[PDB]
Write a protein that binds this ligand. Structure first.
Ligand code: 35P
Length: 376
Protein backbone atom coordinates (compact mmCIF):
# COMPACT_ATOMS: atom_id res chain seq x y z
CA UNK A 1 0.00 0.00 0.00
CA UNK A 2 2.98 2.21 0.98
CA UNK A 3 4.03 5.47 -0.81
CA UNK A 4 0.75 5.54 -2.82
CA UNK A 5 -1.16 5.89 0.51
CA UNK A 6 0.55 9.24 1.16
CA UNK A 7 -0.24 10.27 -2.42
CA UNK A 8 -3.90 9.30 -1.82
CA UNK A 9 -3.99 11.41 1.32
CA UNK A 10 -2.88 14.44 -0.72
CA UNK A 11 -5.38 13.72 -3.45
CA UNK A 12 -8.19 13.52 -0.89
CA UNK A 13 -7.12 16.76 0.70
CA UNK A 14 -7.13 18.50 -2.69
CA UNK A 15 -10.54 17.05 -3.70
CA UNK A 16 -11.99 18.31 -0.38
CA UNK A 17 -10.85 21.86 -1.21
CA UNK A 18 -11.92 21.60 -4.86
CA UNK A 19 -15.46 20.48 -4.06
CA UNK A 20 -15.82 22.00 -0.59
CA UNK A 21 -17.10 18.69 0.87
CA UNK A 22 -16.16 16.48 3.79
CA UNK A 23 -14.55 13.08 3.35
CA UNK A 24 -17.68 10.93 3.91
CA UNK A 25 -19.54 12.89 1.20
CA UNK A 26 -16.50 12.43 -1.06
CA UNK A 27 -16.15 8.64 -0.37
CA UNK A 28 -19.79 7.85 -1.21
CA UNK A 29 -19.59 9.70 -4.55
CA UNK A 30 -17.43 7.07 -6.38
CA UNK A 31 -15.55 9.76 -8.26
CA UNK A 32 -13.20 8.67 -10.97
CA UNK A 33 -10.02 10.64 -10.29
CA UNK A 34 -7.02 10.94 -12.57
CA UNK A 35 -3.92 12.07 -10.72
CA UNK A 36 -0.93 13.92 -12.02
CA UNK A 37 1.51 11.23 -10.98
CA UNK A 38 3.71 9.89 -13.81
CA UNK A 39 4.34 6.20 -13.19
CA UNK A 40 7.75 6.32 -14.78
CA UNK A 41 8.79 9.22 -12.48
CA UNK A 42 7.19 7.61 -9.44
CA UNK A 43 8.88 4.26 -10.02
CA UNK A 44 12.26 6.03 -10.49
CA UNK A 45 11.86 7.91 -7.19
CA UNK A 46 10.78 4.82 -5.24
CA UNK A 47 13.62 2.76 -6.70
CA UNK A 48 16.19 5.45 -5.95
CA UNK A 49 15.08 5.82 -2.32
CA UNK A 50 15.12 2.03 -1.83
CA UNK A 51 18.55 1.73 -3.42
CA UNK A 52 20.29 4.54 -1.55
CA UNK A 53 18.72 3.91 1.91
CA UNK A 54 19.44 0.16 1.67
CA UNK A 55 21.64 -1.03 4.49
CA UNK A 56 21.52 2.37 6.18
CA UNK A 57 20.35 3.19 9.71
CA UNK A 58 16.74 2.07 9.96
CA UNK A 59 15.91 5.54 11.44
CA UNK A 60 17.04 7.23 8.19
CA UNK A 61 14.26 8.79 6.13
CA UNK A 62 13.95 10.40 2.70
CA UNK A 63 11.44 12.50 0.82
CA UNK A 64 11.24 13.22 -2.94
CA UNK A 65 8.88 15.53 -4.83
CA UNK A 66 9.01 16.09 -8.58
CA UNK A 67 6.94 18.84 -10.23
CA UNK A 68 6.28 19.69 -13.89
CA UNK A 69 7.33 23.34 -14.32
CA UNK A 70 4.95 23.71 -17.27
CA UNK A 71 1.90 23.44 -15.06
CA UNK A 72 2.56 22.63 -11.37
CA UNK A 73 1.58 18.95 -11.76
CA UNK A 74 3.06 16.61 -9.19
CA UNK A 75 4.81 13.87 -11.15
CA UNK A 76 6.49 11.96 -8.35
CA UNK A 77 5.90 12.02 -4.61
CA UNK A 78 7.62 9.93 -2.00
CA UNK A 79 6.93 10.93 1.62
CA UNK A 80 7.64 7.59 3.26
CA UNK A 81 6.82 3.88 2.93
CA UNK A 82 3.93 3.83 5.47
CA UNK A 83 0.49 4.73 3.95
CA UNK A 84 -0.75 5.33 7.53
CA UNK A 85 2.43 6.97 8.84
CA UNK A 86 4.16 10.31 8.70
CA UNK A 87 4.54 12.19 5.41
CA UNK A 88 8.13 13.57 5.30
CA UNK A 89 7.36 15.48 2.09
CA UNK A 90 5.03 17.64 4.18
CA UNK A 91 7.23 18.02 7.27
CA UNK A 92 8.65 21.43 8.18
CA UNK A 93 12.36 21.02 7.59
CA UNK A 94 15.46 23.22 7.64
CA UNK A 95 16.78 23.57 4.06
CA UNK A 96 20.31 24.74 4.71
CA UNK A 97 22.16 26.11 1.70
CA UNK A 98 19.43 25.11 -0.75
CA UNK A 99 17.70 28.29 0.40
CA UNK A 100 20.56 30.49 -0.91
CA UNK A 101 18.98 30.57 -4.39
CA UNK A 102 16.27 32.84 -2.99
CA UNK A 103 18.86 35.34 -1.82
CA UNK A 104 20.20 35.27 -5.36
CA UNK A 105 16.74 35.84 -6.75
CA UNK A 106 16.34 38.80 -4.43
CA UNK A 107 19.70 40.23 -5.41
CA UNK A 108 19.11 39.95 -9.14
CA UNK A 109 15.69 41.62 -8.70
CA UNK A 110 17.56 44.65 -7.20
CA UNK A 111 20.05 44.86 -10.02
CA UNK A 112 22.86 43.00 -8.27
CA UNK A 113 24.04 40.58 -10.92
CA UNK A 114 26.06 37.37 -11.18
CA UNK A 115 29.35 39.24 -11.42
CA UNK A 116 28.90 41.17 -8.14
CA UNK A 117 32.11 40.52 -6.14
CA UNK A 118 31.69 39.60 -2.48
CA UNK A 119 34.26 39.01 0.28
CA UNK A 120 34.20 35.38 1.52
CA UNK A 121 36.14 35.90 4.72
CA UNK A 122 34.62 34.88 8.03
CA UNK A 123 32.42 37.31 9.96
CA UNK A 124 30.24 37.64 13.02
CA UNK A 125 26.67 38.93 12.62
CA UNK A 126 24.34 39.56 15.55
CA UNK A 127 26.88 37.74 17.68
CA UNK A 128 26.77 34.59 15.59
CA UNK A 129 29.95 33.38 13.97
CA UNK A 130 29.48 32.82 10.20
CA UNK A 131 31.97 30.44 8.60
CA UNK A 132 32.30 28.12 5.63
CA UNK A 133 32.66 24.35 5.83
CA UNK A 134 36.35 23.43 6.34
CA UNK A 135 37.15 27.17 6.28
CA UNK A 136 36.82 27.13 2.47
CA UNK A 137 36.74 30.53 0.76
CA UNK A 138 37.51 32.26 -2.50
CA UNK A 139 39.09 35.46 -1.16
CA UNK A 140 36.71 37.83 -3.03
CA UNK A 141 34.65 36.17 -5.87
CA UNK A 142 31.37 36.69 -7.58
CA UNK A 143 28.02 35.58 -6.28
CA UNK A 144 27.67 32.84 -8.95
CA UNK A 145 30.98 31.28 -7.85
CA UNK A 146 29.96 31.65 -4.19
CA UNK A 147 26.69 29.82 -4.93
CA UNK A 148 28.55 26.88 -6.55
CA UNK A 149 31.06 26.71 -3.67
CA UNK A 150 28.19 27.31 -1.25
CA UNK A 151 29.92 29.97 0.76
CA UNK A 152 27.89 30.90 3.87
CA UNK A 153 29.96 34.03 4.52
CA UNK A 154 29.49 35.45 1.00
CA UNK A 155 25.73 34.74 1.00
CA UNK A 156 25.37 36.42 4.45
CA UNK A 157 27.10 39.51 3.05
CA UNK A 158 24.95 39.37 -0.07
CA UNK A 159 21.77 39.24 2.06
CA UNK A 160 22.95 42.18 4.15
CA UNK A 161 23.53 44.24 0.97
CA UNK A 162 19.92 43.78 -0.11
CA UNK A 163 17.32 46.44 0.46
CA UNK A 164 15.18 44.68 3.08
CA UNK A 165 17.92 42.27 4.15
CA UNK A 166 16.49 38.95 5.32
CA UNK A 167 12.94 40.15 4.54
CA UNK A 168 13.94 40.46 0.86
CA UNK A 169 15.10 36.83 0.90
CA UNK A 170 11.75 35.81 2.40
CA UNK A 171 9.87 37.90 -0.17
CA UNK A 172 11.71 36.23 -3.04
CA UNK A 173 11.19 32.76 -1.62
CA UNK A 174 7.51 33.35 -1.06
CA UNK A 175 7.11 34.83 -4.55
CA UNK A 176 8.88 31.77 -6.05
CA UNK A 177 6.27 29.51 -4.38
CA UNK A 178 7.53 28.77 -0.86
CA UNK A 179 4.10 28.61 0.75
CA UNK A 180 3.22 31.27 3.30
CA UNK A 181 1.79 28.64 5.65
CA UNK A 182 1.49 24.93 6.13
CA UNK A 183 0.23 22.76 8.88
CA UNK A 184 2.52 23.40 11.83
CA UNK A 185 3.45 26.90 10.69
CA UNK A 186 0.96 29.75 10.27
CA UNK A 187 3.51 32.20 8.98
CA UNK A 188 6.58 30.78 7.24
CA UNK A 189 9.96 32.54 7.17
CA UNK A 190 8.91 34.71 10.16
CA UNK A 191 10.95 34.84 13.36
CA UNK A 192 8.00 35.76 15.59
CA UNK A 193 5.80 33.18 13.89
CA UNK A 194 3.21 35.96 13.36
CA UNK A 195 4.24 37.51 10.05
CA UNK A 196 7.14 39.58 11.29
CA UNK A 197 10.48 39.56 9.51
CA UNK A 198 12.86 36.60 9.37
CA UNK A 199 16.18 36.87 11.06
CA UNK A 200 19.46 36.55 9.22
CA UNK A 201 19.50 32.76 9.39
CA UNK A 202 16.96 32.62 6.57
CA UNK A 203 19.78 32.69 3.98
CA UNK A 204 21.28 29.57 5.51
CA UNK A 205 17.96 27.79 5.37
CA UNK A 206 17.31 27.84 9.11
CA UNK A 207 13.52 28.19 8.77
CA UNK A 208 11.19 25.26 8.20
CA UNK A 209 10.07 24.58 4.68
CA UNK A 210 8.54 21.46 3.06
CA UNK A 211 10.15 19.34 0.36
CA UNK A 212 7.09 20.07 -1.83
CA UNK A 213 7.65 23.84 -1.39
CA UNK A 214 11.27 23.51 -2.55
CA UNK A 215 10.31 21.47 -5.63
CA UNK A 216 7.61 24.00 -6.48
CA UNK A 217 9.79 27.08 -5.99
CA UNK A 218 12.61 25.60 -8.12
CA UNK A 219 9.88 24.71 -10.74
CA UNK A 220 9.15 28.44 -10.95
CA UNK A 221 12.82 29.02 -11.73
CA UNK A 222 12.75 26.17 -14.31
CA UNK A 223 9.75 27.90 -15.97
CA UNK A 224 11.63 31.23 -16.38
CA UNK A 225 9.80 32.75 -13.39
CA UNK A 226 6.26 31.46 -14.04
CA UNK A 227 4.62 29.93 -10.97
CA UNK A 228 1.85 27.29 -10.98
CA UNK A 229 0.27 26.03 -7.75
CA UNK A 230 1.31 22.45 -7.12
CA UNK A 231 -1.49 19.95 -7.57
CA UNK A 232 -2.13 16.25 -7.61
CA UNK A 233 -5.52 16.08 -9.40
CA UNK A 234 -5.60 16.12 -13.21
CA UNK A 235 -9.24 15.19 -13.88
CA UNK A 236 -12.38 14.17 -12.01
CA UNK A 237 -15.38 12.41 -13.62
CA UNK A 238 -18.46 11.20 -11.84
CA UNK A 239 -19.12 7.52 -11.42
CA UNK A 240 -21.82 7.83 -14.06
CA UNK A 241 -19.62 9.72 -16.53
CA UNK A 242 -20.02 13.46 -16.06
CA UNK A 243 -16.78 15.49 -16.15
CA UNK A 244 -16.51 17.60 -12.98
CA UNK A 245 -12.95 18.97 -13.24
CA UNK A 246 -10.22 18.88 -15.86
CA UNK A 247 -6.87 20.65 -15.39
CA UNK A 248 -6.28 20.54 -19.17
CA UNK A 249 -9.14 23.07 -19.94
CA UNK A 250 0.44 30.64 -14.41
CA UNK A 251 1.73 33.79 -12.68
CA UNK A 252 4.94 35.62 -13.74
CA UNK A 253 6.29 35.84 -10.16
CA UNK A 254 9.99 36.31 -10.91
CA UNK A 255 11.21 38.14 -14.03
CA UNK A 256 12.36 35.81 -16.79
CA UNK A 257 15.76 37.53 -16.99
CA UNK A 258 16.24 37.00 -13.27
CA UNK A 259 15.16 33.38 -13.25
CA UNK A 260 17.35 32.52 -16.30
CA UNK A 261 20.41 34.08 -14.58
CA UNK A 262 19.71 32.02 -11.44
CA UNK A 263 19.58 28.94 -13.74
CA UNK A 264 22.87 29.92 -15.29
CA UNK A 265 24.52 30.07 -11.81
CA UNK A 266 23.09 26.66 -10.88
CA UNK A 267 24.05 24.85 -14.13
CA UNK A 268 27.50 23.69 -12.99
CA UNK A 269 26.33 22.56 -9.52
CA UNK A 270 25.12 18.97 -10.15
CA UNK A 271 28.59 18.16 -11.49
CA UNK A 272 30.41 20.20 -8.89
CA UNK A 273 28.45 18.28 -6.24
CA UNK A 274 30.58 15.13 -6.48
CA UNK A 275 29.85 14.44 -10.16
CA UNK A 276 26.06 14.13 -10.13
CA UNK A 277 25.53 15.41 -13.71
CA UNK A 278 22.42 13.79 -15.19
CA UNK A 279 22.83 10.91 -17.61
CA UNK A 280 23.45 11.26 -21.36
CA UNK A 281 24.81 14.81 -21.18
CA UNK A 282 21.55 16.21 -19.97
CA UNK A 283 21.99 19.74 -18.55
CA UNK A 284 20.50 20.60 -15.18
CA UNK A 285 20.39 23.37 -12.57
CA UNK A 286 20.79 22.32 -8.95
CA UNK A 287 21.71 23.26 -5.40
CA UNK A 288 22.75 21.14 -2.45
CA UNK A 289 22.18 21.84 1.24
CA UNK A 290 23.54 20.41 4.50
CA UNK A 291 22.36 21.59 7.96
CA UNK A 292 24.26 21.46 11.22
CA UNK A 293 23.28 19.17 14.02
CA UNK A 294 23.00 21.38 17.13
CA UNK A 295 26.29 23.09 17.85
CA UNK A 296 28.20 19.95 16.87
CA UNK A 297 30.51 19.32 13.90
CA UNK A 298 27.98 16.86 12.41
CA UNK A 299 25.04 17.12 9.94
CA UNK A 300 21.29 16.93 10.45
CA UNK A 301 19.50 17.35 7.12
CA UNK A 302 20.86 16.82 3.64
CA UNK A 303 19.31 18.16 0.47
CA UNK A 304 19.58 18.19 -3.31
CA UNK A 305 17.12 20.29 -5.31
CA UNK A 306 17.38 20.74 -9.05
CA UNK A 307 15.66 20.87 -12.38
CA UNK A 308 15.48 20.78 -16.11
CA UNK A 309 12.89 22.90 -17.92
CA UNK A 310 10.51 19.88 -17.79
CA UNK A 311 11.02 18.55 -14.22
CA UNK A 312 11.93 19.98 -10.82
CA UNK A 313 12.88 17.55 -8.11
CA UNK A 314 13.63 18.16 -4.44
CA UNK A 315 15.20 15.49 -2.20
CA UNK A 316 15.70 15.52 1.55
CA UNK A 317 17.45 12.91 3.65
CA UNK A 318 17.39 12.98 7.48
CA UNK A 319 16.30 10.90 10.43
CA UNK A 320 12.89 10.07 11.74
CA UNK A 321 13.14 12.15 14.98
CA UNK A 322 15.57 14.69 13.59
CA UNK A 323 17.69 14.51 16.74
CA UNK A 324 20.79 12.48 15.72
CA UNK A 325 23.76 13.28 13.47
CA UNK A 326 23.21 12.02 9.97
CA UNK A 327 25.76 9.37 8.91
CA UNK A 328 26.12 6.38 6.59
CA UNK A 329 26.39 2.77 7.80
CA UNK A 330 30.21 3.19 7.56
CA UNK A 331 30.16 6.27 9.76
CA UNK A 332 30.60 8.88 7.03
CA UNK A 333 28.82 12.18 7.41
CA UNK A 334 25.92 12.63 4.90
CA UNK A 335 26.01 15.88 2.92
CA UNK A 336 23.71 17.19 0.17
CA UNK A 337 26.27 15.93 -2.37
CA UNK A 338 25.95 12.42 -0.97
CA UNK A 339 22.77 10.33 -0.69
CA UNK A 340 20.34 13.17 -1.54
CA UNK A 341 22.23 13.84 -4.82
CA UNK A 342 22.37 10.08 -5.54
CA UNK A 343 18.58 9.92 -5.14
CA UNK A 344 17.95 13.19 -7.06
CA UNK A 345 20.13 12.08 -10.01
CA UNK A 346 18.55 8.62 -10.18
CA UNK A 347 15.04 10.00 -9.92
CA UNK A 348 15.71 12.64 -12.59
CA UNK A 349 17.50 10.23 -14.97
CA UNK A 350 14.69 7.70 -14.58
CA UNK A 351 11.82 10.15 -14.89
CA UNK A 352 13.28 11.80 -18.00
CA UNK A 353 14.57 8.62 -19.69
CA UNK A 354 13.46 8.54 -23.32
CA UNK A 355 13.02 12.31 -23.58
CA UNK A 356 15.39 14.53 -25.55
CA UNK A 357 17.88 16.75 -23.74
CA UNK A 358 16.74 20.33 -23.23
CA UNK A 359 19.00 23.39 -22.98
CA UNK A 360 18.28 26.32 -20.73
CA UNK A 361 17.22 29.75 -21.99
CA UNK A 362 20.09 32.09 -22.71
CA UNK A 363 20.20 34.68 -19.94
CA UNK A 364 20.05 38.41 -20.72
CA UNK A 365 21.73 41.22 -18.80
CA UNK A 366 20.78 41.67 -15.13
CA UNK A 367 22.89 43.89 -12.89
CA UNK A 368 25.27 44.34 -15.86
CA UNK A 369 25.93 40.60 -16.39
CA UNK A 370 24.37 38.03 -18.72
CA UNK A 371 25.03 34.61 -17.26
CA UNK A 372 28.11 33.47 -15.27
CA UNK A 373 31.18 35.67 -15.93
CA UNK A 374 33.83 33.75 -17.82
CA UNK A 375 36.88 33.27 -15.59
CA UNK A 376 40.21 35.20 -16.34
C1 35P B 1 24.83 25.03 3.22
O1 35P B 1 24.06 24.06 3.38
C2 35P B 1 26.17 25.16 3.81
N1 35P B 1 26.23 24.25 4.95
C3 35P B 1 27.07 24.45 5.95
O2 35P B 1 27.84 25.39 6.06
C4 35P B 1 27.04 23.37 7.00
O3 35P B 1 27.48 23.93 8.24
C5 35P B 1 27.78 23.08 9.28
C6 35P B 1 27.43 21.71 9.27
C7 35P B 1 27.78 20.91 10.34
C8 35P B 1 28.45 21.46 11.42
C9 35P B 1 28.79 22.80 11.44
C10 35P B 1 28.45 23.62 10.37
C11 35P B 1 27.24 24.86 2.67
N2 35P B 1 26.46 24.08 1.76
C12 35P B 1 26.66 22.66 1.91
C13 35P B 1 25.99 21.94 0.78
O4 35P B 1 25.60 20.78 0.99
O5 35P B 1 25.82 22.61 -0.29
C14 35P B 1 28.17 22.48 2.13
C15 35P B 1 28.43 21.21 2.95
C16 35P B 1 28.92 22.33 0.84
S1 35P B 1 28.60 23.89 3.03
Amino acid sequence: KGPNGLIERQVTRELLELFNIDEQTLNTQGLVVTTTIDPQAQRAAEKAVAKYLDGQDPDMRAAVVSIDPHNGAVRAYYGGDNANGFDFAQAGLQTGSSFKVFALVAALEQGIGLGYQVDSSPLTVDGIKITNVEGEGCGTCNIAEALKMSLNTSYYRLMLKLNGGPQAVADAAHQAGIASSFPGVAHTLSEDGKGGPPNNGIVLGQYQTRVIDMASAYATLAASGIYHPPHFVQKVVSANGQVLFDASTGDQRIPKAVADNVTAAMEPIAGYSRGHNLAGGRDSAAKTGTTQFGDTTANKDAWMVGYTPSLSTAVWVGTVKGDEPLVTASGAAIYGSGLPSDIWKATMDGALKGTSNETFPKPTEVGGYAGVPPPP
